Amino acid sequence: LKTTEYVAEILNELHNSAAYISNEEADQLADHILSSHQIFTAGAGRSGLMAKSFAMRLMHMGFNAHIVGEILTPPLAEGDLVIIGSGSGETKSLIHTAAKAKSLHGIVAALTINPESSIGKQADLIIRMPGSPKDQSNGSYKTIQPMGSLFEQTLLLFYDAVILKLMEKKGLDSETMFTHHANL
Amino acid sequence: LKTTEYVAEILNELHNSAAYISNEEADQLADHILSSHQIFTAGAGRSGLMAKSFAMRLMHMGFNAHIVGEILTPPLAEGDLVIIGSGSGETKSLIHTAAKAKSLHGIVAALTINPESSIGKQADLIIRMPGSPKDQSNGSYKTIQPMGSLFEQTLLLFYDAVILKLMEKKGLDSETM
Numbered sequence: 444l445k446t447t448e449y450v451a452e453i454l455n456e457l458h459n460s461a462a463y464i465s466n467e468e469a470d471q472l473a474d475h476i477l478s479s480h481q482i483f484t485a486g487a488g489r490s491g492l493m494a495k496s497f498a499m500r501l502m503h504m505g506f507n508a509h510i511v512g513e514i515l516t517p518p519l520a521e522g523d524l525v526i527i528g529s530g531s532g533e534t535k536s537l538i539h540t541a542a543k544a545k546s547l548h549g550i551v552a553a554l555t556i557n558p559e560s561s562i563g564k565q566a567d568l569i570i571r572m573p574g575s576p577k578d579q580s581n582g583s584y585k586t587i588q589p590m591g592s593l594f595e596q597t598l599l600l601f602y603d604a605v606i607l608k609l610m611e612k613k614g615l616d617s618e619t620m621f622t623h624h625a626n627l
Numbered sequence: 628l629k630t631t632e633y634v635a636e637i638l639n640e641l642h643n644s645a646a647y648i649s650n651e652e653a654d655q656l657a658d659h660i661l662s663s664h665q666i667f668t669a670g671a672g673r674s675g676l677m678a679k680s681f682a683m684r685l686m687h688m689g690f691n692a693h694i695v696g697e698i699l700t701p702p703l704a705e706g707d708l709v710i711i712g713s714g715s716g717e718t719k720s721l722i723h724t725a726a727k728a729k730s731l732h733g734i735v736a737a738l739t740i741n742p743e744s745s746i747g748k749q750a751d752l753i754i755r756m757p758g759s760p761k762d763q764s765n766g767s768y769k770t771i772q773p774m775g776s777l778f779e780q781t782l783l784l785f786y787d788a789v790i791l792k793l794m795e796k797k798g799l800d801s802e803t804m
Contacts, residue, residue, distance in 0.1 A: 444795065446653035449788035450645050454638070461634045469630035489683060492676045499673060500773065589684065589794075589804040592787055599783060603776055604633035610773075611628070620773045624672075 453596070456586050460573045460597050463583060468570045469601075472526070472552055473608045475568065476506060479524040479550065485511035485540055486528040489595045494528055497602035503622035504609065511540055521548040529553065530574065530594045532560020541565040554598065572597060640770050640777055644757040645784055647767075652754045653785075656710070656736055657792045659752065660690065663708035663734060669695040669724055670712040673779045678712050681786040687804060688793060695724055705732035713737065714758065714778045716744025725749035738782060756781060 444452070476482055482501060484494035494510060501508035509516050511525070519525065525544045529537050532555040541551045541562050553566035556574045563569055574594055578584035586593045610616060660666055666685055668678035678694065685692035693700050695709065703709065709728045713721050716739035725746045728735050737750035740758035747753055758778055762768035770777045794800060 444792070445650045446657060446785075446788050446792045447646055447648050447650045449791040450648065450784055452791070453784050453788055454641060454645055457641075458638060461638060462631060464631050464634065466629045466631045473630065489680050492680050496673045496676050496779070499676075500776075503773065587801065588787065588791065589687070589801050592684075592790075595680070596783065596787065599780060600634055600637050601630075603772060603780065604630050604637055606776070607633040607636065607772060608630045617771055617773050617776075622773060 452587060453593075456588070456593050457596055457600065459584060460593060461600065463573050463578075464601065465571060468568055469605070470608065471568055472570065473605055473612060475524050475550060475552060476501070476605070476609060477612065479522055481507045481509065481517070481520065481523040483509045483511050483516075483519060483523065483525040483544075484528075485525060485537055486598075487534045487536060489591055490528045490530070490598060493595055493598040493602060494526070496599065497526070497605070500603070500606050503624055504606070504613075505623055519544060519547050519549050523549045525549055525551050527551065527553045527562060527566075528555075528598045529560075529562050530556050530572070530591065532557040532562040534562070537562055538565075554601070556594065570601075636771060637780065640772070641780060641784065643767065643769075644777060644781055647757045648785065649755065652752060653789070654792065656752060656754060657789055657796060659708050659734060659736065660685070660789070660793060661796060663706060665691040665693065665701075665703065665707040667693045667695050667700070667703060667707065667709040667728075667733075668712075669709060669721060670782075671718045671720055673775060674712040674714065674782055677779060677782040677786060678710065680783060681710070681789075684787070684790050688790070688797070696720075703728060703731055703733045707733045709733050709735050711735065711737045711746060711750075712782050713739045713744075713746050714756070714775055715739070716741045716746035718746070722746055722749070738785070740778065754785070
């Protein structure tokens with residue numbers, strides 16, 4: 444295949460995966476971002492990178508956004524949000540993050556294939572992601588890509604869409620858009 | 628209005644945008660990756676995040692992948708490839724990177740909206756990205772999202788498409804990874 448055909452193939456995969464996400468949980472996420480005084484994102488590897496890109500945009504929008512596990516991460520307080528992207532829902536690091544977060548009476552929101560997983564079970568809000576063996580045998584999910592790729596891409600677009608819904612709720616657009624980005 | 632609808636909006640913007648890329652360039656980037664003995668990715672901010680995603684997946688295929696500007700990045704020798712993602716092609720940190728790389732006889736590929744930009748003029752391979760004033764005035768390029776969002780999403784999708792082409796050329800699939 445041509446590289447551009449692979450791009451288009453990828454975008455085909457992302458269609459079946461996207462829409463399939465439930466609005467009620469998603470749109471609830473945006474309200475939590477609006478209330479909580481602090482917001483933390485989290486993920487491992489490539490999912491970690493996507494979490495970072497979301498926190499970057501949130502900061503640009505002027506939320507007190509943070510990334511779990513960086514050098515200058517502040518302590519979570521009661522009420523703060525924690526957003527966790529994890530396919531498996533099993534990554535031991537992020538289990539600990541959710542558990543520790545709930546103990547401090549933070550709110551945990553998990554984005555995962557497996558709502559029943561160790562991370563899902565802890566979450567106050569689950570945004571269920573496609574990729575289940577049931578989804579695959581269904582025809583509701585399929586992929587040509589090495590493991591993680593489609594789920595990681597779904598995180599990005601999903602995160603960026605949450606950005607759009609926050610702009611809307613705050614009455615802004617990609618033209619007005621004043622972003623708080625680094626200077627030096 | 629609803630988040631899943633905005634997802635679809637983004638999907639729409641990507642369909643118009645993504646495939647808008649030239650394969651002659653693309654497949655030659657895959658060609659270069661298989662040639663060079665060391666591969667370096669590069670970017671700033673979010674584009675930097677995408678390039679880290681690339682290098683990681685390139686690492687997974689057993690390529691000699693690194694990311695410009697990390698603690699353990701080794702020195703570039705002649706022949707090596709450096710892949711640079713820059714919307715405007717005018718990020719100062721990356722201009723230097725591009726410059727230094729060529730000045731060391733490395734091969735430079737740049738993924739920018741502006742081929743004649745500072746970074747463009749330094750590159751051996753350009754992968755022109757969608758977003759130009761022309762394409763804007765044309766009515767072909769529209770984005771409802773904060774600046775760079777679309778270019779960045781595109782970078783990621785392209786990088787993962789390039790991974791797939793590399794798998795094809797190496798005769799492997801999702802399983803063998």
